[PDB]
Design a protein around this ligand. Structure first.
Ligand code: ADE
Length: 247
């Protein structure tokens, strides 16, 4: 299990938390010094639990699938909450089994569904450590109308931070402030599967992608990424989705 406590948290201690979350994920190999995640694991090995505690000492436990860093659902007290999808129904056979109530959320855990349900796009939802505190409080005292936006804060602060060093560093900097994510963060979130696939292809193709990936950089320019010597591959992406795990 991995834990993070917001009371007394610093940039350094969020960095230690995201390091430990990456270390909790099993990898087959490394390609270009980046962990390649497993394609399939038995249910008994497939899930990791993250414990998150806000400023008021209220704790939720979040279940993640370690093959794709996907959040399956969370527990608050005696009640578990799972996303309305196939992988989350599978997850509920293995985690939070002694929860007295189980609630199935009225959506799946993908962004197009969560943004529709929240009525807000990712660019307009604050991130930073105080926004994670707020997200924990909202999810602990489950308010249906505010859950979807809180779950997007939670996903971006744990899963997306683990996938990219840039996202980890941007969220971790904001200890007593909040910020709105740039299109650079949004395009990294959007492009993880495609970048992962192309880096796996590149290892059999002399470091060259078969299909380019278009990212948005810090100056809001569309940049076309074509190989493993690009900065996003050398010094940013921290985990690779297995090619067998993309559908
Ligand atoms: N539920 C989720 N967990 C992790 N990463 C995601 N990207 C979109 N939805 C996600």
């Amino acid at each position: 299990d991995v834990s993070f406590r917001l009371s007394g948290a610093t940039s350094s201690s969020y960095g230690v938390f995201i390091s430990n979350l990456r270390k909790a994920l099993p990898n087959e190999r490394k390609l270009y010094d980046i962990p390649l995640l497993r394609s399939s694991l038995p249910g008994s090995q497939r899930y990791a639990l993250i414990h998150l505690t806000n400023y008021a000492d209220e704790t939720i436990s979040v279940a993640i699938d370690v093959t794709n860093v996907y959040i399956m659902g969370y527990r608050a007290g005696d009640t578990s909450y799972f996303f309305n999808e196939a992988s989350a129904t599978e997850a509920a056979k293995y985690v939070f089994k002694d929860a007295m109530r189980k609630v199935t959320l009225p959506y799946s855990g993908n962004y197009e569904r969560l943004q529709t349900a929240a009525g807000k796009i990712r660019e307009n939802i604050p991130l930073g450590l105080p926004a994670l505190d707020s997200a924990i409080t909202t999810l602990f005292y489950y308010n249906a109308n505010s859950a979807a936006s809180a779950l997007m804060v939670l996903i971006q602060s744990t899963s997306e931070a683990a996938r990219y060093k840039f996202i980890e560093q941007q969220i971790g900097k904001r200890v007593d402030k909040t910020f709105l994510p740039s299109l650079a963060i949004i395009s990294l979130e959007n492009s993880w599967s495609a970048l992962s696939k192309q880096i796996q292809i590149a290892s059999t193709n002399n470091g060259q992608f078969e299909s380019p990936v278009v990212l948005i950089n810090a100056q809001n320019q569309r940049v076309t990424i074509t190989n493993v010597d690009a900065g996003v591959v050398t010094s940013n992406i921290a985990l690779l989705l297995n090619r067998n795990n993309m559908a």
